[PDB]
């Protein structure tokens, strides 16, 4: 009975997702794949649990590990773009393995990466399995918004976004938000504030704007990004880069994405990713302007964003397995699978 | 093609629901039923639209009006208890008419009214049609909570509620919240703060606690209500009762409902219904304690509660028609039908 589940990647996210998936009598872990870190060790011992008789497999051996242990789904928590994860998707699809990924761009990648996306769509189609993703962006932002949007007669505008602590996802994410950079270093070709329609990767709110445009059945004209550095009126320390941020030096990044459609509906979403002052908490906000009038809005104050990314992924496992073949964006799925007691 | 829709009741709620349902090319209004008010007049003229060639039918003629005009669903916006609406449900069920009602108790009535509810369940079962309801409590409170709850690994406690303006739903609702009453008049057998487990009707949060217990697959031990009057440190005028409320006189009602379950999960929900001070806005709040830890919460500030009650009902029409026979609580339904452009 239990669903055959592979962890593809085994860092901060897939380490916590494991803890929860062990407690779930609904699921069995048949493989754990890292690239290098922890290879050879029993996944449980890594986590602080008793050994489970499943060892961390090597990156280069993924394809054979999936061939053998025959999972129905892979929880792919490695990199953030269809390009970066192409190698791991091919391992999955070729071995008839469905995947749900927390790759942020796979929230909705058809426009940010149409070449690779078309490719992965046709691949998963070929091998009769499903590609789905987005994590926190899928569930806490888009799917919550989708439930609340059901209560609209007409939507003229969606206005929302999220704030997250850029220091708590490691160095790579911090660098990608210009955490250590001068105002001048931040703008510049090799730079995250670089203003150009050719900029890639695209921001999380770009993909999320495309998600709502698909969800609401609208026709995108254009999406534009405005990128500005964040800064602190005091010295802030960054674990991620591992030093003090002087006053006036970039502490992270704001990105607003503005989408126009043929039907006249505007979509604006703001992402704030930065090192935190004392008063700073994670936030999600979504407000709908139209009928009903005055603004139909929800806000989530201080959500445990890291753990919610994993719970969203779990809530998607059976749906991904059951979903049609190819790249399926979650606006084509039911709501995240409902909470019920008795799964443990 | 268009769904055959009867408005059963035609006061403040079903008047606004009509405006929206006319604009929807997806639906056709085949009957409008009041009791007495506006009988004989074209529903459009009542609303401020051009005549639609559908006249307000009389209460006593409901059964024949439904026999004739052959609707698939009735939008029942009359009274608040299975008991009060029994007459209108029988008209519907006997004429093979599905109903979605904004009767607050029908959010989840199995415990507040097990006798009448069993009866209506078996009736709708007999005539191969569906009974569903809750309006704002169903959609803005319970269904939003249900989406957000999907992101929980373990829930130990649900803590939430809503605040609404008790003056803006007319006299009957104001009286039922003790708007004109002395502290002493408020408590007392013939009184809304009357403490007794035999108190009926039950509060909206009682039914909503039962809704979550069903949703989360829990076993209710007991629900208890604590009822306390609200008051203002200044004079407030009430349109609903039509006079000044002296300082210290009840301006409305708080009710907290506390549900214990066999699985150890606690459910607390607070309803505040009162005349508003300057700073007072409608509110919905829902917070989940467990894993993820720290509280997984949403808040909706100043929601247009009256219009959302109607949009929820609209979002439920096709689902009610498609639903199995009998009394179906919305925790057995998909999420409110998603917003899509091109319905008008
Ligand atoms: N959607 C969301 O809300 C959300 C939230 C958080 C993070 N993310 C994204 O999710 C990803 C993972 O986050 P994280 O914090 O867990 O990252 P992490 O701590 O760096 O862990 C990533 C893991 O993937 C492994 N890996 C990388 N390339 C691999 C390959 N080709 N084959 C096999 N394993 C490979 C790494 O191996 P080694 O340990 O050997 O290097 C590591 O175990 C990142 O893209 C991050 O941006 C999305
Ligand atoms: N779930 C929610 O969020 C929510 C929100 C708002 C209100 N409610 C409830 O919804 C109901 C309606 O609200 P409202 O403000 O629209 O009330 P309203 O303004 O008083 O209108 C009620 C309508 O029902 C008609 N009616 C009553 N009994 C009838 C019968 N036996 N046959 C036919 N028609 C009958 C009335 O006829 P006449 O005009 O001739 O009297 C009137 O047209 C109430 O129970 C209210 O408590 C629920
Ligand atoms: N990588 C980010 C994804 C969205 C939440 C914050 C982390
Ligand atoms: N009758 C009340 C139903 C819930 C919202 C406020 C009005």
Numbering used by the authors:
A (entry chain A), B (entry chain A): 8 to 351
What does the paper say about this structure?
Native amine dehydrogenases (nat‐AmDHs) have recently emerged as a potentially valuable new reservoir of enzymes for the sustainable and selective synthesis of chiral amines, catalyzing the NAD(P)H‐dependent ammoniation of carbonyl compounds with high activity and selectivity. MATOUAmDH2, recently identified from the Marine Atlas of Tara Oceans Unigenes (MATOUv1) database of eukaryotic genes, displays exceptional catalytic performance against its best identified substrate, isobutyraldehyde, as well as having broader substrate scope than other nat‐AmDHs. In the interests of providing a platform for the rational engineering of this and other nat‐AmDHs, we have determined the structure of MATOUAmDH2 in complex with NADP+ and also with the cofactor and cyclohexylamine. The two‐domain structure of the MATOU monomer is similar to that observed with CfusAmDH and MsmeAmDH, with a largely N‐terminal Rossman fold domain (residues 8–158; 309–351) and a largely C‐terminal domain 159–309 comprising a seven‐stranded beta sheet.
In this case the crystals were obtained in space group P321 with one molecule in the asymmetric unit, which was in the closed conformation equivalent to that observed with the C monomer of the NADP+‐only complex (rmsd of 0.40 Å over 340 Cα atoms). In this structure, the omit maps revealed clear electron density adjacent to E111, which was modelled and refined successfully as cyclohexylamine. The ligand was, as expected, positioned with its ring plane sandwiched between the nicotinamide ring of NADP+ and the side chain of Y171 and with its nitrogen atom 2.5 Ångstroms from the OE2 carboxylate atom of E111. The acquisition of the MATOUAmDH2 structure in complex with cyclohexylamine permitted us to model substrates into the active site in order to rationalize the observed stereoselectivity of the enzyme. In doing so, we have used Autodock Vina to model the intermediate iminium 16 into the newly described active site of MATOUAmDH2 (SI Section 9).
